[PDB]
């Protein structure tokens, strides 16, 4: 059983620079090194057969180097449709064997949320169930902390967030974030808010709504 | 022209079987080698069986020996994975990829130069259960803009996946479809759309909602109003 090992692991680029990606082997296996391409929600993609043979209808950006337990794929200029996941794969031995993948992501300037916050609907609300969402859009880089407040006091207890991969329009990243309360103790409580704290500021983004009506 | 195309995916118990299949074309099928490859939800790739341009000399992982059977119809050009007592860790999207030209040149190496779309398989006890579909309005008290976000929660389901357009495929641009998160058995995706606030009740923005395995549909109309 060959052990493939890539690095880097994740790795964010400024369109233009240049990278290299490695994928050690734990034994020989010569040329017997392919390198794929996996777009978001496509199939992987032959780019590289035998560590430097490419295939055809790629750039000539792609390079492929290696033998041994030793191989490199080198991207000389980051280019947006270029990011996706890099799969080395050896088929020297049965069974053939893959590494672990290279996730490239697109850095591009810092960016802050626009959020939006949504009381229960009135429909939800029959069913005896009550889910306040929050929208956290359009912002970079990925890392935003986001905490419920009931009434001013933080609420841990029943959320389930949900953050989109990169976009491939700009680079950003979007989330959302749900907490789940009973119509009964939804009824009970009388401000709903959504703290969001990012890079991109020091005072969390906050959004809120009082419960009332009709 | 190499078009490989897998159906046959779905939800099974633990301990039940499947059978999938992939459709050739573009090609002289019998003078390929294929294999089928499983992707995880934790995005890893896995090899999990070859079989010849003629037959005979099938190839397994250790995993996989004694459970799936790798089978090929030269004839009607279909790949198929027969798979059985299957185990939760089974879960994953099945792709039918071919290998390159092969010769008796003394053994050689076997790259995978075309992939298919993927089937996914779900290995669960859990049942289906078709998603409660909600509107999500925001309040017309005081919002910032010329736009407006409006969203709609699909909730309670099972199993992966659901379709969900806005004004039935019009409505393209301004929309974020968040990945679903299981929890307690079901899953719950949401979807949010930015129109500009003018077209704001006046318009109508409906979100549609398919869940293929329950065989349920819903439209459900927001029109951004007052609560």
Redesign the interface.
Request: aromatic share 20%; with cysteine; net charge neutral.
């Given at each position: 059983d060959e052990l493939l090992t890539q690095s880097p692991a994740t790795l964010s680029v400024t369109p233009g620079d240049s990278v290299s990606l490695s994928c050690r082997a734990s034994q020989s296996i010569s040329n017997?090194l392919?390198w794929?391409q996996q777009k978001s929600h496509e199939?992987?993609?032959?780019l590289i057969?035998?560590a430097s043979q490419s295939?055809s209808g790629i750039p000539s950006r792609f390079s492929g180097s290696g033998s041994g337990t030793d191989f490199t794929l080198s991207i000389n200029s980051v280019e947006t449709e270029d990011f996706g996941?890099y799969?080395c794969?050896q088929?020297?031995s049965?069974?053939?064997?893959?590494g672990?993948?290279s996730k490239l992501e697109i850095k591009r300037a810092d960016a802050a949320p626009?959020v939006?916050i949504?009381?229960?609907?009135s429909?939800?609300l029959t069913?005896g169930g009550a889910?306040v969402?929050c929208?956290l859009?359009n912002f970079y880089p990925k890392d935003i902390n986001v905490k419920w407040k009931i009434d001013g006091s933080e609420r841990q207890n029943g959320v389930?967030?949900?953050?989109?991969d990169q976009d491939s329009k700009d680079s950003t990243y979007?989330?959302?974030s749900?907490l789940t309360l009973t119509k009964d103790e939804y009824e009970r409580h009388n401000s709903y808010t959504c703290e969001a704290t990012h890079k991109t500021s020091t005072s969390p983004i906050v959004k809120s709504?009082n419960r009332n009506?009709? | 022209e190499v078009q490989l195309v897998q159906s046959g995916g779905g939800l099974v118990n633990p301990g039940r079987s499947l059978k999938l299949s992939c459709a050739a074309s573009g090609f002289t099928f019998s003078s390929y080698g294929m294999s089928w490859v499983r992707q995880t939800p934790e995005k890893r790739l896995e090899w999990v069986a070859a079989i010849s341009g003629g037959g005979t000399y099938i190839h397994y992982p250790d995993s996989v020996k004694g459970r799936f059977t790798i089978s090929r119809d030269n004839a009607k050009n279909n790949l198929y994975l027969q798979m059985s007592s299957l185990r939760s860790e089974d879960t994953a999207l099945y792709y039918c990829t071919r290998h390159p030209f092969y010769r008796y040149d003394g053994g050689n190496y076997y790259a995978m130069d075309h992939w298919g779309q993927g089937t996914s398989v779900t290995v669960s006890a859990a049942k289906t259960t078709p998603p409660s579909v909600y509107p999500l309005a925001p309040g017309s008290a005081a919002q910032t803009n010329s736009m407006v976000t409006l969203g709609c929660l699909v909730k309670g389901y099972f199993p992966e996946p659901v379709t969900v357009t806005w004004n039935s495929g019009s409505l393209s641009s301004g929309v974020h479809t968040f990945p679903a998160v299981l929890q307690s058995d079901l899953y719950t995706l949401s979807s949010s759309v930015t129109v500009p606030s003018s077209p704001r009740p006046s318009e109508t923005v409906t979100c549609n909602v398919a869940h293929p395995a329950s065989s349920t549909k819903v439209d459900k109309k927001i029109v951004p109003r007052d609560c």
């Open positions: 017997n392919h794929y199939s992987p993609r032959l057969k035998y295939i996941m799969f794969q088929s020297n049965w069974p053939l064997t893959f672990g993948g626009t939006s949504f009381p229960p609907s429909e939800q069913s889910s969402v929208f859009n389930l967030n949900s953050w989109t979007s989330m959302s749900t709504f009506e009709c | -």
